[PDB]
Scaffold this active site. Sequence first.
Site, PDB file in Angstrom:
ATOM      1  N   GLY A 140       0.709  -1.319  -0.026  1.00 39.83           N
ATOM      2  CA  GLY A 140       0.033   0.156  -0.225  1.00 39.83           C
ATOM      3  C   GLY A 140       0.781   1.331   0.060  1.00 39.83           C
ATOM      4  O   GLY A 140       1.993   1.341   0.883  1.00 39.83           O
ATOM      5  N   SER A 141       0.332   2.277  -1.080  1.00 38.39           N
ATOM      6  CA  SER A 141       1.224   3.460  -0.935  1.00 38.39           C
ATOM      7  C   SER A 141       0.451   4.606  -0.398  1.00 38.39           C
ATOM      8  O   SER A 141      -0.484   4.994  -1.130  1.00 38.39           O
ATOM      9  CB  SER A 141       1.805   3.638  -2.278  1.00 38.39           C
ATOM     10  OG  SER A 141       2.362   2.259  -2.871  1.00 38.39           O
TER      11      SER A 141
ATOM     12  N   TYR B 119       2.443  10.177   1.992  1.00 41.13           N
ATOM     13  CA  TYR B 119       3.357   9.959   3.208  1.00 41.13           C
ATOM     14  C   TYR B 119       4.439   9.229   3.065  1.00 41.13           C
ATOM     15  O   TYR B 119       5.621   9.116   3.647  1.00 41.13           O
ATOM     16  CB  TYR B 119       2.614   9.705   4.585  1.00 41.13           C
ATOM     17  N   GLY B 120       4.362   7.944   2.189  1.00 41.60           N
ATOM     18  CA  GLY B 120       5.245   6.939   1.812  1.00 41.60           C
ATOM     19  C   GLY B 120       4.670   5.771   1.336  1.00 41.60           C
ATOM     20  O   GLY B 120       3.408   5.348   1.775  1.00 41.60           O
ATOM     21  N   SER B 121       5.406   4.807   0.711  1.00 37.18           N
ATOM     22  CA  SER B 121       4.887   3.372   0.614  1.00 37.18           C
ATOM     23  C   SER B 121       5.485   2.365   1.498  1.00 37.18           C
ATOM     24  O   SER B 121       6.466   2.670   1.988  1.00 37.18           O
ATOM     25  CB  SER B 121       4.915   3.059  -0.947  1.00 37.18           C
ATOM     26  OG  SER B 121       6.419   2.861  -1.314  1.00 37.18           O
TER      27      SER B 121
ATOM     28  N   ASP C 223      -0.271   4.933  14.034  1.00 37.53           N
ATOM     29  CA  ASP C 223      -0.014   6.292  13.874  1.00 37.53           C
ATOM     30  C   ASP C 223      -0.612   6.880  12.537  1.00 37.53           C
ATOM     31  O   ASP C 223      -1.320   7.989  12.815  1.00 37.53           O
ATOM     32  CB  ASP C 223       1.415   6.716  14.030  1.00 37.53           C
TER      33      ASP C 223
END
Length: 337
Positions: free
Chosen positions: A28-29, A30-32, A163
């Site tokens: 799954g990709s 804030y970042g991946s 988070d």
Amino acid sequence: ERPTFYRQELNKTIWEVPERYQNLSPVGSYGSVCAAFDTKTGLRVAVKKLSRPFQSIIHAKRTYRELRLLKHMKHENVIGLLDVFTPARSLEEFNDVYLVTHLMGADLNNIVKCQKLTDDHVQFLIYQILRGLKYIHSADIIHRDLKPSNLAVNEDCELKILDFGVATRWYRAPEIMLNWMHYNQTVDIWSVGCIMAELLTGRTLFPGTDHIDQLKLILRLVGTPGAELLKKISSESARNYIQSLTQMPKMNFANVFIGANPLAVDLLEKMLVLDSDKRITAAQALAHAYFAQYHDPDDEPVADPYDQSFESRDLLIDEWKSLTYDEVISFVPPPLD
Ligand SMILES: Nc1ccc2c(NC3CC3)nc(-c3ccccc3)nc2c1
Ligand SMILES: OCc1cccc(Oc2ccccc2)c1
């Protein structure tokens, strides 16, 4: 010494991780994030590559914040840091951050695809959320974005609060919809209420299309604010807005949640209080009769104090970047135990 890294390419992004992590597979990709196998402990883990962690001051500070939070969390029901690493050898070239944590099966819409989830199952999942929330809240941290996709659940029904990473607004406390500045930790309790409701009925409790609709649906269940609540509202337009609309009485929750365990209904009544000053806290909720089978007062720990003075600081990108670097450097793995 820093260990041996290897490069590769996953979807549209490069990944430079230690040899210790194997079989990287996008999830799954804030970042991946990739699922990986961690050779050193034998567990499956999640490895998150932050997307341009230092794009701006706001990114830089966000990166610092997430790292500081994740490093502090040490509790069974909160996502914690297995590892954090950069390929970079010095501060000068420090440009990427990778975070490593336990891979958990699903998240709570996925783990709760069996719409009529069992009452004993909701007890155990909500118990675990509240236990994590007690710990988080004890550190003077508010989650603010609790929702089904922020709850990671493995096959054993063990839960961790994530988070970061179905509209957010649906689980959002009404004080936040109204843009109140001085909300407290119980905005998270509100969210737990919405989550529990959804687990008990199979339906989103308040699927607002926008912030106005959201409030309307909320007030529909809990009633329009009384005189006690209204007199604590410091904004004229807010006070005038809610005083303007049609005065709903609070519904009877037993009627709205027909046939659910009466104890679950009672806890919901305590969580879904419009006035946040009267909303049950995480610690109080855990002593509620509904968690009779699970609640153990000597095993619901609190957090070490958490220094978030940094939040009020205004610094340069390079300063946040270097503070983040210090944090990567000083990381001590959690014990293999
Ligand atoms: N002690 C409190 C308790 C609850 C509050 C609340 N929440 C009610 C759902 C409306 N809203 C507001 C507020 C203040 C300014 C602008 C918009 C909202 N304040 C509150 C102060
Ligand atoms: O089940 C989705 C999921 C489980 C565990 C971690 C996760 O994403 C991460 C991974 C690393 C750091 C922060 C969040 C996603």
